[PDB]
Ligand binder design. Sequence first.
Ligand SMILES: [Mg+2]
Ligand SMILES: [Mg+2]
Ligand SMILES: [Mg+2]
Ligand SMILES: [Mg+2]
Lengths: 41, 49, 354, 111, 146, 95, 80, 52
Amino acid sequence: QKRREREQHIAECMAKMPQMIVNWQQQQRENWEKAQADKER
Amino acid sequence: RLQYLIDLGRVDPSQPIDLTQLVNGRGVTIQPLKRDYGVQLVEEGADTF
Amino acid sequence: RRTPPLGPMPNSDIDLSNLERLEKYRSFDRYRRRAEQEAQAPHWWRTYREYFGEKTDPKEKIDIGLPPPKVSRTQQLLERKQAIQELRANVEEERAARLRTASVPLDAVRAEWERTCGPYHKQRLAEYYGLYRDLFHGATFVPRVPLHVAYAVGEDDLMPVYCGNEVTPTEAAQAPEVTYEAEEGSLWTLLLTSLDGHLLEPDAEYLHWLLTNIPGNRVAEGQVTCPYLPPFPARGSGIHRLAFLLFKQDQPIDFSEDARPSPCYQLAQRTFRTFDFYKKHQETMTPAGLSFFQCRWDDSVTYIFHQLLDMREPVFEFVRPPPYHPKQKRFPHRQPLRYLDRYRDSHEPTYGIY
Amino acid sequence: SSKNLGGKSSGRRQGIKKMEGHYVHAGNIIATQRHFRWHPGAHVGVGKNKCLYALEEGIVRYTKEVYVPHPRNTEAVDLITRLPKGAVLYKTFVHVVPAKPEGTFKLVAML
Amino acid sequence: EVDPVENEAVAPEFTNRNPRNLELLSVARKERGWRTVFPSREFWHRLRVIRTQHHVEALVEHQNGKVVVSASTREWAIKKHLYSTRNVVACESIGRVLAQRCLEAGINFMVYQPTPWEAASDSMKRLQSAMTEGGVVLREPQRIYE
Amino acid sequence: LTYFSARKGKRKTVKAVIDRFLRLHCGLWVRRKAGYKKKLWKKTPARKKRLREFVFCNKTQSKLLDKMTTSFWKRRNWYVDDPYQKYHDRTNLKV
Amino acid sequence: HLATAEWIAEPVRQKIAITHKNKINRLGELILTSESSRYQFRNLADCLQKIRDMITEASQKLHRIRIENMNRERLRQKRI
Amino acid sequence: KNILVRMVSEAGTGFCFNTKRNRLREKLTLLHYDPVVKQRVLFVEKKKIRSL
RNA sequence: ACCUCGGAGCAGAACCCAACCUCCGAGCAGUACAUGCUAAGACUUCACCAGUCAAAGCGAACCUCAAUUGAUCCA
Ligand SMILES: [Mg+2]
Ligand SMILES: [Mg+2]
Ligand SMILES: [Mg+2]
Ligand SMILES: [Mg+2]
């Protein structure tokens, strides 16, 4: 039961994972956009 | 070792073999005070047994 | 303690007085060019070329070829330049060159490349592949006859053997069609030999075709002194060299000591040495064409070993030398259990007297 | 008094570990150096403390070769492009001449 | 006893004398090192381009320094069809001819080492594009160490 | 150490040695590297692996540990799934 | 002898032949070797496991060769 | 001025690693290789250990 | 007054080499987040401890710096 619960939790997180990949990446490029705006200032 | 004991006659194959028979044939030494729990049969010489 | 230099120093002829007034490398490309010529210079100190470069004898490798064709340089360059100004007077050529949309006819470029400068390049390729070291023991020739050879595959397909492309023995199983521009009354000899591929002798090669006394461009009426055996490189033995040699023959030559019998499927009889054969017949022909190719093992190769040659197919594999592993210490002071596993022989448990 | 402090560091034990003609196995460190005194040549790799080790197994040879730096090495290219014409730099390089072939083809079956 | 076939005498070690043998098996040594200097000499074959004031020239050359194949605007074969011998059209024509010549000779891989301005130059981009569509790969495969 | 005990008249074992070292029956002493669990944010990955290794000892250190341990720790032990059953013995060792 | 092995079905037998012709001798028999242990028991067990794996798969560098074959096609392109 | 921070994986594997970051910066989120799932996954910060 | 670490001279050219000898510094900072795993062969501050480089391989991609540091127990 413990092993199956751990594997199910890992599978759930990895299922949800690529959306957090892409939205963290767009957040990072938005940080780049804010940084280049601020150094344009 | 088992085949050697059988060929030299210290272990009788015509009767069931256990720890008393092996110890009486002096094929193994067992020290239960030194946490020995018996004899493990290992695979050396399986090709000629 | 000092020792004077054994020759001129490298940066010695540069005047160190007017070093602001001297001309300068402002270009990495200019420095790279000058450093490359200085690296190609001989030098009297120890050099990577001395320790790693290949050391040929200064024999000035003898030409065993045909004399070069003679051209008239003056009218040659006149025709060159007038073709050039005609093309430059073509207005659309300049427009295409400026718009970077021009092109070049590859087939015509190739064909008259073998017309003018293909022979010297072909000699350079075959020198790189090392036939003149192997086939001819150093002696060189410029192949002055374009020797087009192709293999009929399928019903509309054929395989050109150009100067070292890979041709599988499926494509090389039957006889290749050969052409080479020629005149009437001039005799020829065509030879196919496998250099790498001798299973027993490290020095000898195998004859595969010894067609002799060819009247001209027609190839099918000459004396077949040995039938065509398709190449047979063994499994895992690597990539082998097969060479077509074309010889200009002036007189007719008997080939009786070198006539392989009716179908000759013995490698001992098919043993061959281009050095010895051209040594025996040197005063008779002169090499004029050369085309070679590369081959690997195939199922057709398995077929020729089993059915034709009546052989159990040899199998070779490429094995690496055993690793170093220094002499084992009784106390491997700062090493791991991996050191003990390095010197272990068998991976299974052992029990000794028990 | 004696207001000078420090300077008590021991010697680094650097320098040549393998001279000319020494038989050297793969991965053996040839030289250890604080600056680029000897440069890597053929079959000699360089480690991030600028150490020199053998990439192949063989014989160590020290030669003297022309020096053409990488066009991204800015300070070296600056020295090159300020050098006078007709001059070339020379550096001492370390090579390993490999003694053994990579392997052999040998018969394993008679299929 | 069975009489052995006199053909079946095979040497227990094969001696392949092809200089391209271990190279095409990808077990031959590439000359590693020279990490401080330029260019890198860890290759088997190298494309080297020389753009002179009048001519564009290209070699395919072994590690030994032996020239395998060459192609130049110096040759009549190229001069008959270029408007000028120093254009990017010139370079593309040289690359197309050299690509078919390497196809022609059996050199399928080679290592091209341009300096940054050469690599950024349109002529060399057109050159490598012509080489790639001609059929040669400008990246050599890795050596099999084990 | 204690060469003759007060109760038995026997040599005693240094437990600090027992809790730090492992003696293979061939005669080798295995140990861990000092500070292999200290300041790993400072230590580089190659240095971390070097510290995670299990390393042997000198002849001098081995003789010293053999003197601090009694003969009970030098016996041959036939454990069930000992991961050092391979390393208890020497193979192909010439002098 | 692979061809006269009645305990193997016909199409999987042909699949075994065309898949492992590099282990078929000229007498038409399959050859399997094991040298992974110093016990002939384990070596024979490995050989039998190889036979079983071959039967079940029959029931069920490459880059270099591919690119050179593409170049051989591009040289092959010339018709009559 | 800097701080050592422990970052825990978002894959739920419990894997974690310590990095340094400036104290004045916000809460860190990185893409680091998780060896349990054999894949480069997100790690968010979860603790601050000591001051650097 | 100093006590630990590093660079230069003394110690000119493999290594090493002292003084309450002559000078200069260090007890970090910056980047990265595969700064992952594993593994031939070596170096070594004159011992040990500690320290250093690294082929190949798996998996990816297509670190600078000179010192910039602290063992065991225990928490
Ligand atoms: Mg000092
Ligand atoms: Mg000192
Ligand atoms: Mg030491
Ligand atoms: Mg590696």
